[model samples]
Target: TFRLRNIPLLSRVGLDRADELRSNPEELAKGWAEAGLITLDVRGRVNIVDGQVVIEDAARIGDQPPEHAVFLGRIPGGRHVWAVRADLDEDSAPLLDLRRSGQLFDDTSAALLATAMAMLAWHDNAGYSPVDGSPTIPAKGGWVRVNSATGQEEFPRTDPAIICLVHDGGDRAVLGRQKFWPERMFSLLAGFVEAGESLEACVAREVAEEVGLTVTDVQYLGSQPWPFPRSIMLGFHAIGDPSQPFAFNDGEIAEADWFTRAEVRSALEALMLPGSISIAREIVESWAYA
Candidate 1:
């Protein structure tokens, strides 16, 4: 069975954030004193060595002010965790992009780094209130933003997307590739949920629009947070007609095809399938082994 925590970046290892303590100055200061921090460079890349996230003591960063310092949850031993972004170009640490390097870290570290990047990205883009174009500042230990003039609180936003594995009832499944993706790097079809649309509807709609397939027996599989900016991907499995021909619509998908278990195994052995860190890979594996 698939476990959420085993899904690479989804497992978290940190303290439970006491939201009530955020507004308490004394408590906030105390937490900061015991916090461990992860550093991300100006480009949102973090140091990774030998497939592990390089966490540094917050105190060792030398009191340099950070562009963004967000309080992540506390660790099990009662020590807090924070993520900071600053100018670290002079540091000798080799930086890597989270998307390509996430699976390299253990579950806890990967989750912490992903959370930090998502929060920092939100703070960077939300410096002003959308309602009145007023300036905003971080509040609630960086979990919220307050409009300077209106006293309004704004929360971080996460877009919900549906990703599904579409299969023929017997033994075949479909995968597609976008033009911008690396050649032969095909994956399960996915799309963002539209306003007021149910997830099931979104799945069916996306499949039809992208591959001209009519699907049935949509089943909920699982979910994972994909915070490349901020998005939560809901995973599903659906069955479609094996005889139906695929025709690309909207150009979102450049190519589409059906594959049997043998084909999937061959592709995986050749490293032509989805990366190990992605839910798409999990879904495909679930079917390939069934």
Candidate 2:
């Protein structure tokens, strides 16, 4: 594997495995009722009119329900969190639509945007109040704060996780289109950290899980704060030897492949790559000519 440095990689939080409140409706409802949090009725579709997304009250594969929403706070000098409703069905497509329409930011930027959406949706539906009954506020830099007895306080303190960018020995890496992710989304491969697992271990497991490849010589490149609710991405570099073939697992990924540095460079030149605004692109760009 080629070692490259000082390249500006995008920040990622790898929220794929984060324990979201949307999975458990009852607990989420209870948490909100006791917390008295703010709420936002976030909506999305393949298309949006004007600056607003069309929203409906009922939760469906294409529609989100009022009960699933949450509140997000904007406070000064604090990371923001929204009680976002993870409408799995609508998430990938609508987000992809936004990207295609140039309304959505890049992948790195989208990860943070997703965080804001989740937190705000959570607060909207759950009404989660801090120790004090006052609502939280969101800030310009995507920070937030909750009302506390001592004063206004922040909720769920977390640091941005590391985002590692790994590649096969060639001057390039593989991009995956997974069945689990929405089609509009790039569906690039990624995973979250597990308990008791080191960053290297997690990366190895994730690559294997998503693509069934045994990788080695994992190298740590850099990290970034995800702040969506709270997540950090740990970026790294690795080599997947072509001599040893990788098995395909249909469960997660639908398609994947290795790209040459030249192909990637050409894609970058043509702006054909899904979105360069991601940690993966940053890593690839660092060693583009290697």
Candidate 3:
């Protein structure tokens, strides 16, 4: 229970996302002169120096911000931040990227980098409009892409997913493994929320469909921004019966079984346990250490 206090660092609010001024050209121009820019490459990597993202002045680039420069938001200090899309040379870039270097940075940097990564990826995917097949232009400080003809803006979307810990009302919880994962690696059952389903419904449905166990008392725990490609992972705690046989309905889960608290502690050292910056790791830790 003591570890429940530890929320995933990426979910924390790091900066003021100045949505109001994103559309104001003058206000954006004022901030552009002093904005701190993080060069996020096409490969979704940011350069790090001394364990911190190298934030350079946007003014150094040009008289106006580049077309792909995203306004991430204002930090506590007066300065605003931007994610400058770039193709940096290998020798110049020391890529301590988001996934591998989660714990290397502080909470503020982690959250900012996650947002920058997500926003940059969203922009990368929106080079062309999905609706009309027209080439879309970046707008609104890189938060949107506007169809040149219709003038309709395609906003960035966050896919909602529920990752639940299915427990048997005792010491054990269920974990499932994907065949593609490293040998012996397993984690919580997770799935994207359906268009019409509630978070709890998604939890029950995912648990049932994945490993064939009926779950109840699906309670919301917490959430984290998983920006591998823009997903917000909602954590849940559910009650299921370990006595019921696990029928693997989907091929996504190759193997699943009940693991007691002791087993989780043993798995923590291996990549079997989710890494330090993920909500999955914190959720299991909260229960495992309880």
Candidate 4:
């Protein structure tokens, strides 16, 4: 058995660096459709059942318009397969980020979890191809690896490099959470790592852009395998001065704040956060008293 590292505080929740891919959309869609995985009509837009993705709407990020995609492998022998994309739109459905749902996964890890579920669901439906004609069946246990078109790295695809940043106000640290899809989804401030920028630089920029604060000191944290059409979350920690204030940018983030350690603790116990099995909470709790 492998030992799991505790995630860092304020890390992007439900995030990992594995699973991002780039492929031919026409060919991928044709393969899945032929195998009866994804319906031709279910290509774009999320399916809502009483306002939730239900089972049908949970495919992937890059499958939307403006970006053609490719198929990788399914979840073990299951129907899910990893997909890849050359480009994608910043403004997508799950991007809307609502409220009540935001608290579902607590603050630190909801986004990553959602991405995982969505990607897995997508694979469960649309993973058909010649390379990995056999679908990957998700294990009922720990995280597993699925084959990608490109060579394997610690994380997945190159774009939208995800990360988590923590702010410890001396005594304790607070986890970051924001609205996501279907009411409100818990998410971190993140974006793609641009050319000529170090992954550390990208984390700092994302924190500043989204939360209006500078990550004075950034440290590497644990990572996960995201796999939603292929992308990865690089986790880290950042120190934000409480003396200074923050301003939320209009485009990417709606609002930002430093929740008390107590509040975060409360949310975790309540399951007010989405899944009880989330990484964000684990990360934040570790740093809460340190």
Candidate 5:
């Protein structure tokens, strides 16, 4: 059986989630004390030394209160990993934003940072209960926020989005550019998933909405956690006729055209594709070089 190669970069994260330990208070404390730290600054950027994120020892960094730290499960060798918010001198240290730095790190570092950043982003926006408009506090080792008023618990939020490659199932595929993108930059069509639609249904709707092509055989390719502000991009590939005219029927919001394997290979330098850290690139290449 043939398989899809070229796995998305962020999806290579190989960390044990170790969900069992996040329950007990004593286990939480012990895990925190024994864990390695991946620190994010006030601006939500991580510190990188050499090629990867600097995982400082928890013993040296000391315990910084449970709510202030997120237990990001365990790495190999039974050692736990954690993320803590910190105040660091940006001018002196090499602080790289995840978007720019993610492609360069090893999988373990990538996994830890993405998880930590996602958790922290949730905490940043979860200070108050949406229902009661009352104050809430971080609980359950930074995974849950409990409201003081009604004792309601709110978990981390991760938005689900779709990025798709619409193709002729042979040589050509659709590539598009948003109004806001840089000059010459084109990527696969993408959008946020609707409240009630299935992922496959969303794929079909999005392809038609953005590219004006009715696609079939909606194939689930793979997924990547895009933690820039917490989103998990579900990547897909579907069949479409390249002869159908391109349309921007919705809001005149996007510009798209068909690209062939040769065109994409040429565009690697001449055109601006999605970044190395994106699943959009992986899905596109998976078809182009198939």
Candidate 6:
């Protein structure tokens, strides 16, 4: 079986989310009494030191109550995990962005923090119900939101995106860099899965649109929860036609190119590649070593 443990931010410690228990108000209240909270600043940064989650008691962060907090499930020992959104200036903890700092933390902490941030973002935007425009309130330990008028419940949303490593049958793989990425950094090609499209179709379409290459033999790799405001990145590997000429289909990709194993090895040694935390890095490393 393909192991995701080596992929940073992909490993989870099996938090007993206990979805059934969330509906019980009394149980949720009791869980909160013994809960430990992760604090995210207004800018959505979390406290991390030496690759660990540094959290404070949810009961005390500021004189004012937290703007938004959600139940993230419980550890093996039954300690509830909650995450709160608070003002950054109120605390002295060193804050870090998950995109850049996630690889520094262990798998469990990264998973927990990512889940917390995603849920908090959901609560922030879902203050009103779309059906009736009625004000909604957090329910089921912040896992569900209920409309006051019709009592309709809404759940968290996660956008699905496909990230794929496209390779020729021989020894070359194609990688691309977005305009916003740092210099000399290239990773797998990815795009959101459009409606009415299969995952393989999405992979092929993304490859053709981004780099003007026809891909075949698209295969599933793995997936990762990328909760930068709610996204689940599905990973794939595909084989491309080396004979086809490449062109930039849209402005999304600044540049795309094919790299041989030797080239990737050199780039890896020089650290001119995707960060270790990203699925992009995992895809590249897997292709290079294969």
Count of clashing pairs, candidate 3: 0
lDDT of 3 by residue, 266-288 (tens): 78755277566778888888888
Which portions of model 6 miss their true places by more than 4 Å?
1-5, 61-67
Q: Name the regions of candidate 2 deviating beyond 4 angstroms.
A: 1-166, 170-172, 180-188, 227-230
What are the lDDT scores of the predictions, listed in order?
0.77, 0.48, 0.84, 0.44, 0.80, 0.78
Clashing pairs in 6: none
Which runs in model 3 stand beyond 4 Å of their true positions?
1-3, 269-271
Off by over 4 Å in 5: 1-3, 59-64
Winner on TM-score (3 vs 4): 3
lDDT of model number 4:
0.44
Global CA lDDT computed for model 6: 0.78
Instruction: Put down candidate 2 lDDT per residue, 1-290, tens digits, no spaces.
Output: 55444433324324332244434445433333223222223452222335333332222322222333333322223322233334435553343332234234444334434454444533443233456565554322223344433446454444434344446665657666667756533323567777788878877788787777787887876664443444555667777765555566637777677767787677766524655444555666665755
Over 18-72, each residue of candidate 4 has an lDDT whose tens digit, in order, gives 2322234444343343221221112222223344322222134334321222232
Off by over 4 Å in 4: 1-160, 172-187, 276-279
Which lDDT tens digits does candidate 5 get at residues 1-290?
A: 11257778778856787777776667777766667878897666887766678877887776644577888887666877788888878788788776887777777778888888888888888899999898898877788889989999988989999988888878878888877877778888888899999998999998888778899988888888988788999988888887788788665345888888888877654456745778887776667667
Per-residue error for 180 in candidate 6, Å, reads: 3.9
What's model 6's TM-score? 0.89
Tens-digit lDDT string for candidate 1 (240-274): 98688887887888888888989997887662785
List the RMSD of every prediction in angstroms: 2.8, 11.6, 2.0, 12.4, 2.3, 2.8
Residue 153 displacement (Å), model 3: 1.8
- The candidate with the higher TM-score, 4 or 5, is 5
Q: After aligning candidate 5 to the native by TM-score, how far in Å is the CA of 258 from where it should be?
A: 0.8
